[PDB]
Structure formats: C-alpha cells, structure tokens
C-alpha cells in the first residue's frame, strides 16, 4: 500500500499556496467625514463666540428713556492632541516576508483611525483625551417624552431639539444594534413601520441619513448639524516611520515601526449637538 | 526635559487665530413677511370701515310703502409707535477692535427686528405697546370642540371660524414645540398621520402653510388671512447712529450706539384672525 | 418739552388718510345658480301637472269587464313677488363724498340679492313671501335611519329618497358648520374619512357637489335635483335709480336711492327635493 | 288706487303659460329585459322541463350489461294571459286639448308595462295570474347561513345555490331600500365596504348586475340565470285602440281608449331561480 | 363560456389506440454515495425499477324512449344527447378523483395521493390556510403545485373568509372572486366529497389517455325496440388514468 | 364469448409503450452555487489569516512612552476529500437496454452531487467528512431575541449579526418546512404579511434571496455572505468511468460503473456565517 | 282488396305534421247556453309485427309482396278497433263508443223489430243539427238482421231477388268484428269527426332484432300513426242491442 499519508509517500505532495492574507472585518469610517477637515500648524486654537446677548429692545414712549442692551464674549480654547502606537518586530522576519512591511503599514493606519474615531465621538475631554462630541453635546430634553412613545419617536424629538438653535441637523449616530431593533418596530396592529419583510429599509430616518457605528456606545444616540457645528484640525497627517537604530534594536536585530497623528477637535456650536440615553 | 509645558518652553508656540466671530442661532423672521407691507410719513393713520349695515330689504306688497335701510360708518385710527435700544460701549474696545462696530450694527438690527416680530404677534395694546394680532384676533369658539378631538382637529376648526367672515385663511402660526407633537401624531393602529419615519412631513396642514416660530407662546395658536387682514406701515426703517458726546460719554471716554425704528400696525379685518389655547 | 400730545404740538401732524372703504364679508351667493333661470313679461305663471293617476290595469279573465283607470290634473300657479328697499340720504354727504354714490349702489344690490337667496331657501309662503325650497321640499323619511349611522350616512339616505321618485339629485345644501364637522369624521382607528391632515377635502360627497351656505339654517339640510326641479323667473332685474323729488326730499335737500327687483319661484317637482333635521 | 287684484285692473294681466305637462317619476322598466323574449301565435304553450335526472352512468366491465339511466321531466303548460285597462274620456276634452290623447297613450302603455313587471315578478299563478319568478323560484337554503354573516354574504350564498342546477346567475333583484342599506355597509373598523363617502358605488355586486326595482317587495330577493332559465312569449304587443261607438259613447259624446297586451311566461329551468327573506 | 375548469384540463391529455399502457418508473434508488477514505473500498449503490400498468376502462349508459317522440321532436333529439354527455362527463371526474382502483374502477387520484400531514396544522389556522400547507407538501417531491380540487360548498365558504377587521380576503363585494388560490387554479366539483380536498402538480404528475372520445349512437333495431317502436340512445367513452408521480398529489380532511 | 383476458384473445392486443423512464423528484442543487468555485491541482490548501490584532493605539502625553501594539497570525489548512460510489450491472441489461447507460450516469451524478451538498452544509468535519458551513458558522446571539418576535424577526436579527463582522450578507438558508410557516405569517388583524390568498410570495426576504432546500435540517437555519466567506476548490470534476475488466467482471459477464469527484472546502471568514435554532 | 266499407272511409281524411292537435268539442245545449271544450287529439301509433324465416322470404318474391298485403288488412282490423272501441287512455285513441251519446230508450215502440231500433237512432242524429252518415255493426248481428221474416213468412228486409250490397235506410254498413256482440253505432261521420294521417302505412324489415339474426328469421312490420278528433260528440250515438 503506497498511500499519501505522513508515514508514506504523502511527503511528496505540496499543499497549494493561497496568494494573499485574510484581513478581518474592515470597519467603514464615518465620524471624521461628518465634520469639516481644516488644517493648522500650531499646538492650539482660539475661536471667539458670543456668550450672553442681553437684548432689552422694547417699545419706547415719546420723550422717554430708551433701553440699554449689553453683550458678552469669551475666548474658547481647543488644544491639539497626539495619537500613536508602535510595533517592535524582528528584522529577520521583515526580510523573509517582504509583503509584511506594506501590510503592517496599512494595518497600523486602520488601527489608529479606529481609536481616532473613538476619540472624536467619545473623547473624555480630560487630560490628553480630546473633548469628544458626546462630552460637549447638550443633554437631551427629558420633557419631550410623551405617553406611548416608540424609540423612534425619541430620535424624532432629538431632531427638533437641534432646531432650538435655529440650525438644521446633518445626521444620526446610533449603535448598529439599536438601529436594528428600531427598523424592526411594529405597530399595535402587527405591521412593520419601516418596510415589509419583502425588503430591508434603507438607512434613512425622518429625511435625515442614519449612521450606524460600533464606535457609538450601546444605548447612546447623537444628533446634530455636524456638517458645520464642529471641525477637525489636522496638525500632522497620519504617517508611518521606521527605525533600525532605535534603542537596542540594532543589537537585538529588531525593527521598530511607528504610526502617529496630530488632531485638534473644535466645538463651535454645542447647542447644535445632542446626546441621550435610550431608557428601556 | 524640554517640553511644551507652561513652565517650560511652551511659550514660543502661539495658538492659531480663527477669524470671524461665532454668531448664535438666527431666528428666521416670518410674522413681518406675512402681513401686507406699505409705508407712510405721518404720525398716525386713519381708515374707515362700514360699521353697521341695517339691511331691511324685504318683500313689498303692491301699492304699499317699501322698507328703509341704513348704513353706519366709523373712523378707525392706527397710531405709530417707536422701538429702540442702545449700547454703551468703551472707546478702548472700539479702537482696539475695528470690526466690532460693524458687528454690533448687524447685531442690533436682528435684536430689534426680533422684538418687532415679538410685538406684531403678542402686542399688548396697552400704553405704547402695539395692538398685536393676538389681542385683536377674535377669540376661538370653545363650542366647536367636540369629544375625541386631537390638537390637529382644533386647528382645523379654527380654519373654519375664519370662514365665518367670508375670508379664506392663509397661514397657521404655532410654537415649534407644539407643531412637533402635532406632526408626530398616531392613530389606534400606531401609524403616523403626517408621514412614516421614512421621511419628515413638510410644513403644511389642511392645504395651508404652517409657520413655526419661537415668537409664538407655547400652547397658543393663531390662524387667519394675514395677507389681506392687516398691514404694516413703516414710518422709519431700522437705523443705527453713534454718539461720542452723549451725556458724560466724552468724559468717561465712552461711546453710545443707538438703533431705532418706527412702526404702525393696522387691523382692517379682526374677524379674519383667531387666537386659541390648548386645554391639555 | 414739545411732544406730539394733543395738549401740545401734536396738532401740526395730520394722520395719513388710507384711501378705500372697508366692506364686511361678502357671502358667496348660490342657490339662485342651482336653479334653472328663465324670463317672463307677465305677473304670474300657470303650469300643469298630473295630480292623481289611478292605475287599475290588471290581468283580465276571458269574456270579462276590464278595469277602468282614471287620471286627475291641476292648475298650479306661481305668483310674482317684488323685493326691494330704499335709502334716504343727505344731499350734503352725497356731494361732499363723491365715491359714496356708487358705494351705496354696490351695497343695496348685495343686500337685496342676499334676501333673495334667503327667500329661495326659507320662503314662508305667507302671502307675500315666496314658497321657498324648504316649505315645499318633501320631509326626510326617518324610517331610513339605521342603527349607528353617521351624519354622513343620513345625507346618503336623503340622496336616495330623491331616487324614490325616479329623479337624480343635483347637489347638497348644508350649514357651513355642519359640513365642517362632517368632513372631519374618523373611523374606529383614527384615519380621516375624507382626507388626512395633508390637505382639506373637496366640497364633494357621494358623487354630488356640496354647497355650504350661511343662508342654510344650522342642523338643516336640503338635497335634491335642482337643475330639473325648480325654476326662477325674472320679471325685472335688480335695478337702482335715484330721485331727489320724492316728497319732502326737495325741500329737505334729501336724496332717495331705490333698489328693486321682481321674481317668481316655480316648483315643478316638489318630490325631487328633500329637507330634514340632524339629530343632536 | 289702481291695483292688480280682482277688484281693480288685474283682469288685464294674463299669466304666462308654461308649454308642456309635468309627468311624475317615470320608473325605469326592467325584469322583462332580463328574460328571453320570443313571439308566438297560440292561445297557450305546452312545454316540458327536466324534473329528475337519474344518472346511473358508471364504469362498465367488458362483455357486461350497461347501466340504464332515465330523465323524468314534467309537462308544464304556459297559458297566454291578457293584461289591459281602459279610460272613458269626454269627447269635448279630447278636441279642446289636441295632444291630450298622445299623452294618455304613452301614459297607459306605462301603467300597463308597470303592472306587467309586477306579474312577471310576483305572479300568483292562481287563475288569470301568471306564474311569477318568485312563485316558481326554489326556496333559499337556510343551512348556508353561518355565524356572523352580513346581508351581502347571503346574496353571495344564493348565487352559489343557483349553481346547484349549474347555470350562471344573470343578476340580482332587490328592493331599492335593501340595496341601499347594503351599499352603505361598513367593516368592524369603520371603513366603507363599497365606495366610501367620496363617491357612490355602481349597481354591481359580485361581478353580477344588480337590479333595484320597487316591484320587488321589501325584505325579498331573487337571484338566478334569468337570461337563460325563463322566457317571455309575446302573443300580442302592447297596443292602444280608440272607439267612440263603444256602448252608448256615440250617444254621450264619449271616447273609450283601450290599452291591451297579451303575454305568456315559461319556466324551462326553475331550479335555477332562488328566492328568500332577509331575517332581521 | 362555462368552463368549470375541466378536471381533465389539469392533467396531460394524450391519445392511445391499445388495450392498456405500460410505463417504467424508478422504484428504489439506493444512494450510498459518501466520503471515501484513501485506498479503501467504495460504496455500492443500487437502483430498482417496476413495470407499472394503467388499464383502459369503459364508461357509458343508455336510455330508451319512444320513437314517435324523437323523430317527431328533432330539437329534443339533440337535447337528450347533450344531457347524456354532461351526465357521463360528470361521472368521468367521479372516477378520476375517487376511483376505487379495484375491479373496473379507475385508480383515482385520492386513492393514489399521499396522505396529508396532520402536523402541518397550526393553532388557529383558516381553511384556506390549510390548503396553503398542502401546496407545500407537494414540494416534498420537487414539483410545483398545479391545481386545487374542492367541493363547491367548501370552496364557497372559503372565498367568503374575512379578517378580524371585516373586509373580504379574496375580493371586495364589488366584483366576484375568480377561481384562484395562491396563484393556483381551483376546480369546484360536486364529485369531491365535502371536507375532502386534493392538491398537487397535476400539470405533469398524471396523464389521461383517450382511447375513444365520448360518442353518442342510436339503434333503431335493438332487441325489443323495433316492435315497441322505440329507440336506444348510447353515450360511451374509453379512458385510462396513468399515475406517474403519486408523491406529487395530496388528499386530506378539513378538520373543523 | 370472445373476451380479451388471459383465457381468451387478449394476448393479441399489445399494450402501448410509453417512451423512456419516469425520473423521481430531482432536488434543486443550490449550496454549491452560493460559494466561490475555485480550481486546484494539489492535495490540500494553506491560507493565512490575521488572528489577534492587539490594537493599543491611544492618546499619548507629550514626551511620554508610547503604546505597543502586536499582531498574530495562523496557517489554516483545508484538506481535499474524495466522494464517489459505484454500481455494477449485468452486461446483458446494458446491451439489451441502450438507453440505460446514459441514464445510470445522470443518476449517479445527481446522487453524488446530492451527498455533496449534504456535506458542504452539514459536514461533520471529523474523519474524512468536510468541515461543513454549519459546523464552522458562529452561533446565533440569543441576546438579540426580544419579547414578541416572530421567526421572520429572528432571521432579520441574523442578517445583522453578519454585519457584526463588517460584511454584507448574501442569502438565507432554511428548511422549506420552516420557510413555509413563515410566508404564512399574519398581523393582529389576520392579513398575510407576504401573500394574502391571491398569489404565492416570491423567495425573497429582507431584500435577500431565500434558499429553501431539504439539505437544511428542520429547525436549523444559516445566514451569511457565502459568496465571499468560503470557497470550494475542485481537484477533480464529477466524472463517470466504466470498467468491464474490474476484478471478476469479465468472467461474470458484468460491468462496473464508477462516479468519482474530489473536493476541498475552505472557510475564510467563519464570523460571516450564522447558525441557530427555532425554539417553539 | 276486400270489397267492404271501412270505418276509416266513413270519416273525413286529412293530413298533418304535428305531435298532437288543439281542437274544440261541444258538450251540451239547453235550448240559451251552449257548451264547448278545447280538447287534445294525440297522434298515437298502431301496428302488428309478424316474423317468419329468411329461408322462405328469399325463396319467393311473389310471397314477398303477398305478406305486405296480408298485413295491411290485418292492420285495418286493429285500426278499426282503436277508432271504434278505442279506450283513449295510454296508447289508445279517443274512441267513439266512449265519446258517443247513449241511445234514447224512450223511442222504442212495443211491437217493432230489431232493425226499427236502428232507424230510431238515425233520428237522434238530426237532434244535433247534423246529417247521418253510416252504421257500424257486428257481422253476426248484421247477419241476423238481413235474415228477418214476419209472423207469416215474408221477408222483412227483402228478397235476394232485388238484393245489392251493404246498405240500410240508404246508409253504408260496416260489419266489423271490433264491434261487440250486441252493440251498435250511428253518426254523421262524413262531416262530424275526422281522422288526420301523420304517417301512411309503410313497411320495413330487419334481420337483426330480438333474436332473428341468430335464428335466421326476419321480422316484418306495418307501422302507421294517425290522430282521431271528435268535433260533435252529439252527432254520434252508441246503444246496446237489447235481446
């Protein structure tokens, strides 16, 4: 018996190589594209906004004292932060596998862009963390909730609250799961609100485009006129550098790869952004 | 450690200046544009309307004396009122900030026109306050309210009460807060009345354009044929003047900025306007 | 102080006169248009109708006396009544105010034509008054009312009662308020029977044109085939002539304006008209 | 004093004559239009109609005896009955009123065809009366009624019972009032089953033409294949003859007008006609 | 046009000229195709066949009436004829649908048809809901259903189904409902017993073979006849029902 | 008696032969077409996929140590299995029935391909069996189930779970039995969400094509982006060879027919496939 | 060609082309108020089959036509029965004896003969505003009548010397066996009640029949269908010959 087992003639057949590497789910970036992309060259930004406009204009009787109106201002600061991470690899591995170099680069950019988007949306606003949209966003009005309101009614309300600043909304940010449980809403009769089982509804709600991102926490929603309520300032575009002489890399026969970026998030009109919690 | 800290070498870096002052939300003016416009150059206005038309036109018997009809007239007057306000600023701020005056000018106009619109609607009528639409408007008929009516029905009822003057309506004034809860109405099944979540309904109701304005008090509505019920008469347009010698301004090294305007609201047909209140 | 007050220099500024007199609401005249229009040069009208048709036609046995049928007739008369009214005015007022002349004319004509419509619909028939559509109209058959009928069903029933005399109905006449409450009917769900809030329903129901007129008493409705049931006969069109020699007039420098008209309403088929009362 | 009343010169005014006469509601003739029409020339008509078809057709074994099946029909006879009536009028009237006769003719023909339609539908069958559709008609199957059926369901049921004889139903005969109370049916939610308030529905039910004649008694209904099952035989068409020599007419200046007609109703397939009563 | 949707039309119509018909169908396909270990013995598959026969049966009936009525009344002559055809064709279905299969009776559909799945019945189903289930059971043979057979009585109450709202399911009173269900034609036959229903892919699962068309003949001189001055009318027909796919037909009971 | 049975002249008439054979129900092959059909020429396959991407990208303080990120890989193998079966028939049968040869071929193919599909879906994975989709697929997230969900709701949930891998779904796989009970879903009123007893609904759900095959187990269901999550590699196409000299087939006048095939199933992204159970 | 008058000849002969007929009779008359009735005359068939053998029929052409004539006569004798004593029920014709008015016994004179009774009946014919036509008797009865003598010996009817054919009181006599033994009938058949012939007496044959084909026998049949109508039931009188 001359089989193709290991302990036989099987050591003659070489398994076919599948050209290429299998990359996991490539998340579609959104948050960054929702804002204005301007670039700077300094470590901070200073914009000026009208604080308190005490308008006392009124009807004045003939030959009488007219009303006095006062205005207030403020200098708002927006610091630039830095995001980055490095990978220490074997100088040997890099030579034995050429395509690895180009791969690591494309993978470090995505890896960075993720925690970038994660900042733009949920920036703690503390020490180094950026002042993310959700930290700035004016809290949702708990009074807009009426008897028997669907989860969809809430977002509808949110959209209005944006108008309380005389500004049109741009889009809606929801966690994919929440968006899901919403499209599957039914009426007291049993029917489907968005679309019959015959076809999955498009990503639109109340005329406004919907943006489902895993970056958005579960049970948290954000609505506003992002297209011009805040803008991102690029001090330095994300780039990848490599050093052979870094530390003891020359001695351990290693290679250090770096991928960094410098961002600065400015929040012009916080009244045009709303964050809330899906009470359920 | 030569960092960018405040106590270190972080003094050479100057934050990038972002040009332009950030103006808040600009409330879209409407009430002014609704009413017919015309101007005068007098202190007041005098129009005459048919008061009491005693119509006794009846069937007359042959060889008999016919009926006598009478027509009464009245002289109605509409006084011109003045609206204004001033800002006492410092000369220091004025010279050190060039584009400031230019800003205040294009700011006081809005601040004034805001009260202008606020007057035309909720005009007190007492003293120097204008006799706004809500004061003149014939009160809503509580009798029209039937058991099981939504806020949408009430407005529909009002549109009819306007017809009792043989004049068709042309607009519906509502507080954005209320207009919202109306657009988001549901039936027993659960479906939306104005439009499914797929898209937001346009600002129209019963064939008549809806005008949502923050100038309209919450829980108050106004309907009528404004385009032919009342007319605004402008004596003097919004003007801005500055004075260096006003009072002790010369000594205190100050500068006063004034912004005034002269109006006159006439109400030809009060029966063509209605004011109401939602009881809920 | 030199103010615009009365007890001051306010005597030099004369209020601007607004050209034009403000007429009240002019009711859109109908009814007279629903009926056929003919002209006459006599003082009365005589037409003939089949009174009683005694049809005894039946099956006849061989060699037997047959049934004798009989027919009765009648001479129906429609007298010509005169409607008018006059107005006595001072020669001063008429000369000092030129436009007044032509104004009074356009007012008496309306005031006259108003009572004209008022007769055609609710004519007492008492001597001088015309026999209006309602005094003639065949009463609604209460037996048609089923359990749980809406005010809309009632009209539908009425329309049929006309067919019960082999005659097609022309239109429906109701008080504006009633027509309103009708158009705003809802089902056990909430949907609008005639039209969702999007737009107001057209003045049409059950294929027949609806005619809302303040001339129609509240709670009263009149359905029928007016186009081929009744006819209006004009002896003399509405004319307006003035004279200042009428009695005292010349010696008191007065002016008497007259506005007369001669009519005659004929009711050919009273069975084709229906009047009734809604259940409160 | 010179009026238009009797006392004065009112004698000079002669009322305007209205050319023409007013005929009452001319009922639209049907029923006989639903049946097959044929001409004859006999005093009666001996025919036959399949009563019982004993079908014994079955699978036959080879060299075996075939099944004997017979068709038993009864020999029914359709007698020729005569319908008519006459009018004894004054000769003075006939000469003074020219077109009077022409009227009476077209008037008696109507009265005749009217009581004719009354026979074809509800013919007693006793003596001189014909065997009307409702007499011959096979009773409705009460077992077809189910829990919670509407009047509309019943007719639908009947239509099926017509198929028991295997013959497509020609139409549905109902009393105008019943047909009415049917068109105005609503579902358990409110919506209109037929046309809605917007427009009246056509006289069609279950694809079959509906015939609403006052000839049909209230609460009674008839469904079947009229255009196939039964046939009308015209011995003598409806004609009108006049004679002033009849009896003692010549001696009293009288004119006797006769309107006669000879008929004969046959029923080929009685199983194809259903009659019933609406239980309320 | 009273096409009661002839039950025959639902089946393939072919002509023959012999005593009977013989077709071959695959009985048992023993499929053992499976994964095979290297250098090992493979699975042996097998196939079974059968020579299924469909006999040609004869259907007919006769009547005897006086000649003085036939040759004397011509339009009646053809009447009796056209009635015997209807009478025969009516019993024709009677076999095609409920054939005993024994003796001379044809092997009817219901006899062959695979039983209905009593488990498919869910809590709170309509009558039409069940028929829908049947349409699926037909798919257990990889064949699109072709038609639905029902008793006029049952079918009647079917088209009159209503929702908890009030409206009709098959059609608002404005117009009559056409004989169709889930896109499948429906045949109302008195031949189909009440409470019984038949569904399947008739279009290509069973075929009817006509040996002799329904013909009517008369005999002036048959036995007695000549003496009794009578006449014997005969309406015969020769059929043969073949059943290719039995799994493609369903029979059940409206448990309600 | 001269009949046509055995004991008579029935042997003279030969039964009519029906052309060819009647093949049973041929199941529709689907699964194989849902995947990528690749070609090979080896014994096995080696593809590399990124395992654990330890992304530690974060916001770094000035002049501070950066976050170290790491990446992990793996070499996944896909073995080539062999599927086949043979059938030895009598030499006689083959020569006496020419149509048989080509028939057996067509049957062995359908028989093989049938067990092929039976592997691709529910491949055990152990021994020589392939690693079928179901044994690879990620289990359905029970958490996604909300109170009051239909079977159709669950499938909708699965479609989302696919997106949780940043990949769009391709189709739905269900046992016709379960799929059936789904198309027959009704609302609280009783209407069919898909059909409505007029026409059978198409095999499409939520915009995605539905695939009902007996290959899928009862109660089990699979959803994912098949046309990209996996790939089938063919080493040897389905071929049928005939041997007459196989062992003692020469001496027994036999003939063996073989039908072999070589496959290899690869599972690139298991996260893009879901499997579950309908608890009910 | 039997030289004898037929009851068929007595009545008026006409043709028809219908299933039945709608004619009108005459009941009573109180001489006023006359009575009439719209009656029906059904066209019923009559005939009698005769079967022999083809071995004889094919071996004699002269005998062929012979039987045809022997049956035509055999038919008339049966046809005569349907006309006279016709039951008028199932497949029987509206008979004469059934429709005929009974004899008036109050017309018999004590001392007359058997023939005198016949003369009395001829008179009752006039009592209907009609003229008499003929007499129908039983051969045996009619025989005894022709052979009558008085108390002395002389012939009542008349000697063979100046004898002729079948007449009595100047009227045709039809001696039929269909007439019961001791019964008679008189009427104005010539213009009273007549017969309408739908189909004349035709003859057809068939080798295939009840047996025939297997027995080699052949069946012969003379089918004839007609209708008998009675216009004046008063113009006919049937009576019982009392003896």
Tab-separated table of C-alpha atoms in Angstrom, chain D residues 48 50 53 55-62 65-71 73 141 143-144 146 148-150 152-153 156-160 163-168 187-195 201 204-208 269, chain E residues 1-2 4 19 57-64 76 79-80 83-84 86-88 90-91 95 104-106 151-154 156-157 159-160 162-168 171-177 188 190 223 234-236 238:
chain	number	residue	atom	x	y	z
D	48	UNK	CA	-91.605	20.392	-20.776
D	50	UNK	CA	-86.407	18.340	-16.787
D	53	UNK	CA	-82.293	13.221	-13.931
D	55	UNK	CA	-77.803	9.473	-13.565
D	56	UNK	CA	-76.577	5.883	-13.482
D	57	UNK	CA	-73.544	6.275	-15.759
D	58	UNK	CA	-70.733	4.144	-14.339
D	59	UNK	CA	-67.687	2.047	-15.245
D	60	UNK	CA	-68.798	-0.955	-17.287
D	61	UNK	CA	-66.983	-4.292	-17.305
D	62	UNK	CA	-66.196	-5.926	-20.649
D	65	UNK	CA	-74.567	-5.038	-19.303
D	66	UNK	CA	-74.555	-1.229	-19.370
D	67	UNK	CA	-76.380	0.940	-16.784
D	68	UNK	CA	-79.842	2.288	-17.597
D	69	UNK	CA	-80.400	5.913	-16.607
D	70	UNK	CA	-83.598	7.844	-17.315
D	71	UNK	CA	-84.592	11.507	-17.403
D	73	UNK	CA	-89.474	15.681	-16.930
D	141	UNK	CA	-81.084	27.215	1.589
D	143	UNK	CA	-78.353	25.967	6.081
D	144	UNK	CA	-75.893	28.123	4.114
D	146	UNK	CA	-73.084	30.913	9.148
D	148	UNK	CA	-71.717	36.384	11.705
D	149	UNK	CA	-72.910	36.798	8.117
D	150	UNK	CA	-73.857	40.110	6.526
D	152	UNK	CA	-74.078	40.793	1.405
D	153	UNK	CA	-72.907	37.302	2.401
D	156	UNK	CA	-73.300	35.607	-2.306
D	157	UNK	CA	-74.645	32.360	-0.820
D	158	UNK	CA	-77.715	32.485	-3.073
D	159	UNK	CA	-75.529	32.956	-6.161
D	160	UNK	CA	-73.946	29.606	-5.289
D	163	UNK	CA	-75.060	26.771	-9.424
D	164	UNK	CA	-76.740	23.747	-7.801
D	165	UNK	CA	-78.656	23.449	-11.076
D	166	UNK	CA	-75.487	24.538	-12.896
D	167	UNK	CA	-76.366	27.839	-14.554
D	168	UNK	CA	-74.523	31.146	-14.190
D	187	UNK	CA	-66.426	46.909	8.346
D	188	UNK	CA	-65.861	46.309	12.069
D	189	UNK	CA	-63.362	49.181	11.953
D	190	UNK	CA	-65.415	51.836	10.154
D	191	UNK	CA	-64.108	51.917	6.561
D	192	UNK	CA	-66.749	51.698	3.793
D	193	UNK	CA	-67.147	48.319	2.092
D	194	UNK	CA	-68.242	49.723	-1.275
D	195	UNK	CA	-67.288	53.255	-2.272
D	201	UNK	CA	-70.781	52.779	-5.832
D	204	UNK	CA	-72.841	45.800	-9.366
D	205	UNK	CA	-72.313	43.077	-6.774
D	206	UNK	CA	-70.049	40.034	-7.078
D	207	UNK	CA	-69.491	40.858	-10.741
D	208	UNK	CA	-73.235	40.489	-11.300
D	269	UNK	CA	-85.244	25.526	-15.535
E	1	UNK	CA	-68.314	30.191	-21.546
E	2	UNK	CA	-68.981	27.846	-18.633
E	4	UNK	CA	-65.885	24.743	-14.944
E	19	UNK	CA	-55.750	-2.200	-24.619
E	57	UNK	CA	-61.668	1.117	-18.650
E	58	UNK	CA	-65.005	1.794	-20.352
E	59	UNK	CA	-67.729	4.166	-19.137
E	60	UNK	CA	-71.244	4.517	-20.528
E	61	UNK	CA	-75.006	4.473	-20.047
E	62	UNK	CA	-78.120	4.186	-22.196
E	63	UNK	CA	-81.745	5.304	-22.368
E	64	UNK	CA	-84.799	4.137	-24.315
E	76	UNK	CA	-85.409	17.300	-28.239
E	79	UNK	CA	-81.237	17.632	-26.117
E	80	UNK	CA	-81.178	14.161	-24.549
E	83	UNK	CA	-77.551	15.780	-21.469
E	84	UNK	CA	-76.090	12.267	-21.511
E	86	UNK	CA	-72.898	16.067	-19.361
E	87	UNK	CA	-74.133	13.163	-17.248
E	88	UNK	CA	-71.261	10.952	-18.394
E	90	UNK	CA	-69.795	14.309	-14.658
E	91	UNK	CA	-69.240	10.691	-13.577
E	95	UNK	CA	-63.659	8.141	-11.172
E	104	UNK	CA	-63.208	-1.841	-13.212
E	105	UNK	CA	-62.986	1.416	-11.252
E	106	UNK	CA	-60.017	3.541	-12.329
E	151	UNK	CA	-66.303	20.715	-3.058
E	152	UNK	CA	-68.279	23.800	-4.258
E	153	UNK	CA	-69.846	24.044	-0.789
E	154	UNK	CA	-66.461	24.151	0.956
E	156	UNK	CA	-67.766	28.733	-1.435
E	157	UNK	CA	-67.287	29.401	2.285
E	159	UNK	CA	-63.832	32.731	-0.802
E	160	UNK	CA	-66.005	34.354	1.869
E	162	UNK	CA	-62.817	37.661	6.462
E	163	UNK	CA	-60.158	39.257	8.642
E	164	UNK	CA	-60.725	40.447	12.221
E	165	UNK	CA	-61.333	43.834	10.587
E	166	UNK	CA	-64.302	42.824	8.453
E	167	UNK	CA	-63.120	43.012	4.832
E	168	UNK	CA	-63.031	40.017	2.487
E	171	UNK	CA	-62.232	40.188	-3.082
E	172	UNK	CA	-64.435	43.082	-2.066
E	173	UNK	CA	-68.157	42.559	-2.979
E	174	UNK	CA	-67.654	44.962	-5.912
E	175	UNK	CA	-66.520	42.046	-8.104
E	176	UNK	CA	-66.761	38.254	-7.940
E	177	UNK	CA	-63.705	36.285	-6.899
E	188	UNK	CA	-65.321	23.239	-7.791
E	190	UNK	CA	-69.697	18.058	-6.662
E	223	UNK	CA	-83.837	-6.215	-29.432
E	234	UNK	CA	-75.973	5.288	-26.046
E	235	UNK	CA	-73.232	7.552	-24.706
E	236	UNK	CA	-69.922	5.718	-24.276
E	238	UNK	CA	-62.971	4.736	-23.139
